[PDB]
Paper text:
ADSL is involved in the de novo purine biosynthesis and recycling pathways in which it catalyses the conversion of 5-aminoimidazole-(N-succinylocarboxamide) (SAICAR) to 5-aminoimidazole-4-carboxamide ribotide (AICAR) and the conversion of succinyladenosine monophosphate (SAMP) to adenosine monophosphate (AMP), respectively. Both reactions are β-eliminations in which fumarate is released. Domain 1 (residues 22–112) and domain 2 form the base and one side of the active site thus creating a binding cleft for the substrate, while domain 3 (residues 365–450) resembles a lid which sits on top of the active site.
Co-crystallisation of nADSL with its other products AICAR and fumarate (AICAR/fumarate) yielded a different crystal form than seen for the apo and AMP/fumarate bound crystals. In this new crystal form, two nADSL tetramers are present in the asymmetric unit (tetramer ABCD and tetramer EFGH) in contrast to the single tetramer present in the apo and AMP/fumarate bound structures. More specifically, domain 3 is tilted by around 20–25° towards the active site in two protomers of tetramer EFGH (chains G and F) and in one protomer of tetramer ABCD (chain D). As such, the conformation of domain 3 in the G chain will be referred to as the ‘closed conformation’ in the remainder of the text while the conformation in chain F will be referred to as the ‘semi-closed conformation’. However, since domain 3 closure occurs through a rigid body movement involving two hinge points near its N- and C-terminus (Leu377 and Phe449), the central region of the domain (including residue 429) is structurally identical in all three conformations. However, in the AICAR/fumarate bound nADSL structure, Arg396 is inserted into the active site and forms part of a hydrogen bond network involving residues from domain 1 in the semi-closed conformation and the catalytic C3-loop (belonging to domain 2) in the fully closed conformation. Indeed, electron density for the C3-loop is only clearly defined in the protomers of the AICAR/fumarate bound nADSL structure where domain 3 adopts the closed or semi-closed conformation. In those active sites in which the domain adopts the semi-closed or open conformation, the reverse enzymatic reaction appeared to have occurred in the crystals since they all have substrate SAICAR bound. In contrast, the adjacent Ser290 residue directly H-bonds with the carboxyl group of fumarate thus being more favourable situated to act as catalytic base.
Numbering used by the authors:
A (entry chain C): 9 to 283, 295 to 391, 437 to 482
B (entry chain B): 8 to 45, 108 to 484
C (entry chain A): 8 to 281, 295 to 484
D (entry chain D): 8 to 286, 295 to 386, 398 to 426, 445 to 484
Write the structure that this text describes.
């Protein structure tokens, strides 16, 4: 409803798919999924849980009474316990075995880790598409000379495609980082209130092996290759630093790229798509990318003051910054893909600017000729001042870019939103 | 709204309804049409002036809540001005303070915030009527070259919007430096609240003080015996976000090119509202905490008894010397007895028995009868209770005076 | 110092000698001794057993600091303040027993830091005022010089060079107001004792509260502060450090925006600082950025100070306070130098206006047409087609804007051909720009500069 | 340095001599000259008109740097690189004409910075490894020692001293993995020309692309890098600076958390950092670590901002910022690791205090064994809690065996140390013996 504040990330910017990943339906559904997996594995390992209790839970995974959970939360001041009661109300037989041996972080943290990994999996293809569209552009314009800029003053010629490779390289570094974080992300698993699994050890009457099995079993049900051995109550909040640092770095890359595009628009050498002509899409990318960089200080601060086995001063902050970083990243990648699909180049403006400055950039050619008038047209040919630019493009795209794009070949065809 | 898609936690969970509506979309387009009933304009005529109206309303909602927090803590500070408590530097036992004096550390920081929020609210200027690049060229042409009519128009809508003052100089926008000034003060407030709520969480570990806890409240899903400072922890958590947010407007302002670039717009839709919604939640939550603080004097007194003996050694020597003992002998004998008591505490896990040892040693016969008086906690608190009253009267109560009519409201939490 | 070990570029390269001296260890430890002397003086006046000869001994050795011996004491004790108490007591053997009487380390640590902060603000203020003044001269001189306006960095309604300069001046004036406010409202820690209770001083004056308050007020006045805290822990509240570095961070943002504009104006060839690269402006941006970054230090520090003090503030503050001020010092000096030597190229400014103004001017041309034979509709539609033709020449052929040539050639505009020079006159497109400049400078700028009139003449030098 | 002007406490107080030397001007300008020599060497080998005597002249004067003359040239020119070219040419009069042949300032500026960063990472890695190793010894030694667990800093189910130590070790191991990765993946700028096109070098080799690639690869190997960028502007991408300072910022957070825990353990009297006999016992070393670690976290916003506003092939608004933040991040990291090593070598534990605190909370720690049950114990627990706090009494679950209460803690320690920690320490086995000294 427009009568109260609504995040522009929900109402304006981010994709439906990313919005669903950070939704409360997906969150509390996944809590129930985790409670089911715990009960399943606990029964398999010999605890007194009946087939009918398990079926009851399985039938009501998505049957979530939000109104009743809010009333319980107002009464108890504990969101996890509110949802245990609410789940126990629609599963009266199972009510007594839900959450058996566990702490709130069993559902809280593991859900957050499932969410993070799904969210990374949504970002990766979009980033790959951005890189791919820019790679097409870079190849197509590999040989098109353009005035180089250092200190934003006229400098030795480069090419439009070579400059595009500066942007592509930064984005490829981001793709490498996002892949790494996604692949190295570990599950909290089943660890108990302070990470000792003391509760589960007592439930299995001192059988260490059964405890390790339980941990490994729910880890596999959730689709993770690996779980922590060491935790406190929580997974280490250093994980949140690693994830938001990579998104912050992506922010910087996008901000630089979109800043270049905005400058190229002033120069009239290049313009973003349009369905006075302003680079509004690039400006929005910069704007949002900035927020992405800002957000890195949240998890840095959070992790630095976590006392002992956990303090709850992480919780509210994480409800805000994790979702917003991903929703912001999602919007920037979509928007940048749309930009890269529709870039318009104006070679006659590019050539005119070179003609105005190239004379100053030469003179050394004219002296070398003198040492030995009719040659002047050939000596001021812009193509000869670009050094190895077009050769650099081809070598870079082949050796460094195309191999990173290979795994996303099947999803390349999707066109952007806006 | 729905739970089938993402909602901001500040909207769904934390934010007061008034502050929610201040950053509301309906409230934004009411203000936009209010501003056109008040034509050669640019988008920022409604965009920026609405944002300035919103900021000022939002500050006006925060101010009373902060004042109430200060007032509740001031009541607490007066009530406990003389209650001795162990001082802490490096979080090690240190010269005694009082519960109320410590509360004044918190009150002072919050008063500095109230001064800052008042200042920013009062000095906030209106963009007014300025045209596409701030030259008013459109309005000058509409009034066929009459400069005076243009200045009047600017001054007139400025007054209709309820601002004392408008910029002379703008580009298309009001300078985004204004956004730095507003979020810097909220960031500083964040730091104050984080420190205070961190102290409260430590006091809970020490069992000297606890935040309010409802009859039916559950601390933990797994440990039923637990009572956690979860309200204070949430305050810290949100206060941190408030500090983080200051880098948004700092960065935004630094890269605004010429008379305006639009890379401010999306960022400002996020950070301005969220800073105010975050501040709103923390003030309401901290008010609720301060209204319900529970103190445990018996624990406070026990901790003093355990540590005071070590603090008091200089008093005991001065007494011994006054009774005609030797500073050298006295110092050396206390030193040995102190290490013995220290080893009992650390190596045996026992109580501090230094007083028991001094009573048992016949070298201190001259001062045995003085020992109750020499270890009296009231004499170790210096000027603590006098500091409280002077501070409350000279520095705190005057800042609260304008909010006297709205002090009675209690702060509710539904989670 | 020596190039064989790391030196801060803020010391070795950037900041002024005067700011460097304010954050030096000589000034620091000299001021520790000054504060110990003031404490002894006031304590004697209020009746404590301190002789005139002990006071004179301390007064004679304020500058006589054995750094080698203080380092050896610090290696043995691991306490910098106590090391310096011993070292001071070694050259003042008679006074040794009464130095630091009743005090805690923060008596010298914090009060020195507050004296340093205030001196450092007093060095920044005039430099900022001079920057504002030089830009104000420039703004007045160029108040009427039309220049292309920029929104989204696209051509937009004309402004003037002086009016644009006022955007910069305004932000810097807000900084001057902020620095003045913080300087004036800065309070002294004074004499407060280990946990801020003054318990030690109360015992020294045998329970006389009034004598304790006078001691506090007396050393506060000797240090030259109008006001002291009533409430402290061991330290002054580290919120003070947030207030100071926030204002410097905001200044950073202002300077970064201004110097970014100047760098863009250099690309446009409309303006240059004193291949020609705007390296001074680029350095200002670079350093201004560090100034903005630094604000998160004190925000974090203050937020995790437990109870009456934790020492996790100390090392951080040795770095960030000095560096913020040294960075600010360099940026202001460098920006003053830039503003003193700005070179403008009006012929380039005029050429760029000629290229774009035709597109801006269509509304004037219609109003003239309506005033002649009329039809706003026909006029609008015919200009629209001719404008797209001229636009394609600019973008697709890389040519000059020929829209005026096309309007002269089209016989529909016969009624207004003779008006065209006057209708495209840049002076009439600048709205109230020059009037805004004069009103702003008089009402808002000159009054803030008035107190710094005597120090305006100093030129800002650069050695690299 | 002299105390009459401001000096960085990172130089004058905190960081090691070795890290200070790496960020010194002697090492910087010495390395500029080294890079000019390598360029001349490779250029001669590839056929450019450079004599053996010109190369010798340069090689003899690598360390012979006239700082006074370079400052005078820099005041005259306002270009530090060109000042040093003139100054170097002044002592190698024969070579003067071929110094910097074909190159741009970033050839010496950036490549030196990349050599410095790599060396600096190589100094940090062993110190971090030693910290992890000392804590690993401690963790094994105390794997079975029960201690009160803390969540929300309230008493919670028992852990062990060694298991808690593994929380710290894990975070630090993640840092070691990150520092290794960044060190190994760091690429050289190499030889790239004013705008990264190598146009100058292409013209010098009369259009021979292959010779240009060889030159790049040759100086890259002389500098000891496996790999160089293909793509650059004038500079290496400043995103590299984000990657390096992000990892150091994350390390800062880890150290801050650890040292915060230690400071809390000191209040509880369960554990204390080392003290020097001649030194109330405060955790001042841990407090300094926190203090400096904070600065390390703060610094990450410098390179994030810098990279985001680099226009086109380069803008010079990176330069001053990088002179400050790169050195300071590494010097700050250096100090924190050395100081934390010293702390971990001297940790003192007080088991009798640990045991007493457990005895005081034990009734609550048996509730997990005993577990609508929850609700009951909750009401009876608040009743017992009020007796403790409001009446000052013992915890009484009259209202209602230590051995099971630490769960799998000691087993977790052994599995973690063996599977995850010891393998990361293996390469640093030869340098483990060094003790970490502090002078203040
Ligand atoms: N308000 C503008 C401006 C502007 O003010 N000035 C124009 C002229 C004018 O609008 O009067 C100029 O070129 O000077 N440009 C874009 N927009 C709009 O900004 C909105 C973009 O939302 P975003 O997601 O980027 O925050 C969205 O509502 C629009 O894109
Ligand atoms: N100033 C103190 C304080 C303190 O205030 N102590 C009180 C008593 C108390 O607070 O317990 C006193 O007056 O003695 N504690 C340490 N230090 C010293 O601070 C120095 C810290 O240097 P760092 O490297 O951490 O910046 C370092 O040289 C010193 O350790
Ligand atoms: N290194 C350069 C560059 C540059 O890379 N220029 C190219 C050419 C070009 O891109 O235009 C070149 O090969 O020289 N420009 C300046 N300077 C110099 O950098 C010094 C910067 O000082 P700062 O105080 O900002 O760190 C300062 O002493 C010098 O200005
Ligand atoms: N895991 C825990 O220790 C824990 N302790 C309390 N809680 C509950 O989680 C919620 C936290 O909300 P917030 O993130 O706003 O602090 C509250 O309902 C609180 O009782 C937990 N999840
Ligand atoms: O809710 C839980 O399970 C844990 C709470 C706590 O550790 O206090
Ligand atoms: Cl669990
Ligand atoms: Cl307007
Ligand atoms: Cl004092
Ligand atoms: Cl090069």
């Amino acid at each position: 409803s427009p009568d109260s504040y609504r995040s522009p990330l929900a109402s304006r910017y981010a994709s439906p798919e990313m919005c669903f990943v950070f939704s409360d339906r997906y969150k509390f559904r996944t809590w129930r999924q985790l409670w089911l997996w715990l009960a399943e594995a606990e029964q398999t390992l010999g605890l007194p849980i009946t087939d009918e209790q398990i079926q009851e839970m399985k039938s009501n995974l998505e049957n979530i009474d939000f109104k009743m959970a809010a009333e319980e939360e107002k009464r108890l001041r504990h969101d996890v316990m509110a949802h245990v009661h609410t789940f126990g109300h629609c599963c009266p037989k199972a009510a007594g075995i839900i959450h058996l041996g566990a702490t709130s972080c069993y559902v809280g943290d593991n859900t957050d880790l499932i969410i993070l990994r799904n969210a990374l999996d949504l970002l990766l293809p979009k980033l790959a598409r951005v890189i791919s569209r820019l790679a097409d552009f870079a190849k197509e314009r590999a040989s098109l000379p353009t005035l180089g800029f250092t200190h934003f003053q006229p400098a030795q010629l480069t090419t439009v495609g070579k400059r595009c490779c500066l942007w592509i390289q930064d984005l490829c570094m981001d793709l490498q980082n996002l892949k790494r974080v996604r692949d190295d992300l570990r599950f909290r698993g089943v660890k108990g209130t302070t990470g000792t699994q003391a509760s589960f050890l007592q439930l299995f009457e001192g059988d260490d092996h059964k405890v390790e099995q339980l941990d490994k079993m729910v880890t596999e049900k959730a689709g993770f290759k690996r779980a922590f051995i060491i935790t406190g109550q929580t997974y280490t909040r250093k994980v949140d630093i690693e994830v938001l640092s990579v998104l912050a770095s992506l922010g910087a890359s996008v901000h630089k790229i979109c800043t270049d595009i905005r400058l190229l628009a002033n120069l009239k050498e290049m313009e973003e798509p349009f369905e006075k002509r302003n680079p509004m899409r690039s400006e929005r990318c910069c704007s949002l990318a900035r927020h992405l960089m800002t957000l890195v200080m949240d998890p840095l601060q959070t992790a630095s003051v976590q006392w002992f086995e956990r303090t709850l001063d992480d919780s509210a902050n994480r409800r805000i910054c994790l979702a917003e970083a991903f929703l912001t990243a999602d919007t920037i990648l979509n928007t940048l893909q749309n930009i890269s699909e529709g870039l318009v180049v104006y070679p006659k403006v590019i050539e005119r600017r070179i003609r105005q400055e190239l004379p100053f950039m030469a003179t050394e050619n004219i002296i070398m000729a003198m040492v030995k008038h009719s040659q002047l047209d050939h000596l001021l040919d812009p193509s000869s001042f670009t050094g190895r630019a077009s050769q650099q493009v081809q070598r870079f795209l082949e050796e460094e870019v195309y191999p990173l794009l290979k795994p996303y070949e099947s999803v390349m065809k999707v066109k952007a939103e806006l």
